[PDB]
Symmetry: C2
């Protein structure tokens, strides 16, 4: 009659070892030693209850974090993709910028060699204009000297025309003798007049002509302004180029420093890719680790 | 009577097991009586529990691990996220100083282009001016040629007047003193004719000088003409070249704008990951906590 209860308690233990936690523990009301032991066992049953409970909450917590890492992961993923896409868009561009910079530098270096060329052919043309200016001055002098001497020949004609008067008057001193004389004096007069005609034609021609040299002189002189002016505008072109070259090998070393920061960045993007794959693996591992913990106490029927 | 000692003892064994203490073997398994059966029962439970405990201990250690891994995984990410921020700094800075120089270029191109075109207009007006000179020279020269032809008539007349007067003088002084009078007049005509012939030679040789200088000068302005031609086609080439730089600098500034935008896109990303960094420090601390709860749920803690 002690046999019956302690066997019953033994069964109770068994029933607990199978994970049956919800059944009452018998004999807790006895005030004999059996009661002490039943109480011990009810205490066991309670202590197991709380443990399964804790483990189960632990499993569900972790299943929660697994799920949270996961969705935090799926973000960093497509967000990291976005980054690598953005990063190639900027790689593409820095390649175009080196292309365009290198070209602009050669294109400046051309213009410069080209302008110095204009400069040097303008200076040569400068010196050829000098010579022309000079030779115009000479022509101007010669031409005035011609005006001068032709006016003298007009004088002589006038004068020899006057002597024809005297020769006529000296001829008529022997009428019938100075008849031939009279003809000569006539001839002289005729020769003077034609000779004056020629003189005056030349006056017209030479005065006109003098007009022309002075005009041609101002034209040639301006042709020299022109050379000076070109040289000037073409030099300022050469400077402008010196400056473009300087801002180009400048842009060159700045593109350069950017390509470097970009290598940095696709290195870190690459790593974020790695981090993502790993983080997915961690999540999976956590999920299964909660599965195992749940399974470890799942036979237990509680409360 | 006697057998209340093992009752109490078993009670104590059960309180150890409840307390999380499993290492002690249960006594009284050797009895044939009912106690023995129960001691065996406690033994079966003890050993089942050791096993359940151990999976759970293993569970938590795996969480502790997982967590501190996620943690270090997250410290690297943090330092790559500042490293990324700092890189994106330099980049933005470099686009700044490179957006400056692209503008400086479009300006200096514009400014060169004008200078070139300015010389182009000049060297072209220049060519029109050289043309006018070559024409004036032809004028000057046609005229001199005309003057030559007439000067020659004045020479002719001088010649004729010389002979006319020399014959008249001769035939008058032949008459004695009766024709001394005429002889002197004829004589002064001969001298006047001599002067006039000499004047006309001086003009003839001055005309020679002019014409010669005209041909020469004319050949020289021709070449000046062709040097302005050469300049035009040079500066024109330079104008074309500036066009090509206005281009570069335009597609460049579009390059800066793609990069500008993409650098912003990656500014978003950088800040978002900073969010991720501490969000996940915090997941890692929470995982560490569940591991802790799990080991403590099953520790020998004297509960
Ligand atoms: Cl450039
Ligand atoms: Cl053992």
């Amino acid at each position: 009659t002690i046999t019956r209860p302690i066997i019953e308690l033994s069964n109770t233990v068994d029933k607990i070892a199978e994970g049956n936690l919800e059944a009452e523990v018998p004999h807790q009301n006895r005030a004999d030693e059996i009661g002490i032991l039943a109480k011990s066992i009810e205490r066991l049953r309670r202590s197991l209850m709380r443990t399964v409970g804790d483990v189960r909450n632990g499993a569900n917590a972790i299943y929660s974090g697994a799920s949270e890492i996961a969705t935090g992961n799926n973000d960093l993923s497509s967000r990291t993709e976005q980054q690598a896409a953005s990063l190639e868009e900027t790689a593409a561009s820095m390649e175009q910028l080196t292309a365009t910079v290198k070209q602009n530098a050669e294109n400046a270096r051309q213009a410069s060699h080209l302008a110095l060329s204009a400069s040097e052919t303008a200076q040569r043309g400068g010196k050829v204009v000098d010579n022309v200016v000079q030779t115009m001055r000479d022509i101007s002098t010669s031409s005035q000297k011609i005006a001068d001497i032709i006016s003298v020949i007009d004088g002589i004609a006038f004068q020899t025309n006057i002597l024809a008067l005297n020769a006529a008057v000296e001829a008529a001193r022997a009428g019938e003798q100075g008849r031939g004389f009279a003809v000569v004096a006539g001839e002289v007069r005729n020769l003077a007049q034609r000779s004056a005609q020629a003189a005056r034609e030349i006056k017209s021609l030479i005065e006109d002509s003098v007009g022309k040299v002075d005009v041609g002189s101002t034209l040639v002189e301006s042709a020299g302004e022109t050379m000076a002016e070109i040289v000037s505008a073409v030099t300022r072109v050469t400077d402008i180029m010196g400056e473009i070259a300087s801002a180009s090998d400048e842009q060159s070393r700045g593109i350069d420093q950017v390509g470097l920061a970009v290598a940095e960045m696709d290195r870190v993007t690459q790593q974020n890719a790695a981090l993502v794959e790993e983080s997915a693996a961690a999540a999976a591992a956590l999920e299964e680790q909660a599965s195992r913990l749940t399974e470890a106490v799942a036979v237990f029927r509680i409360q």
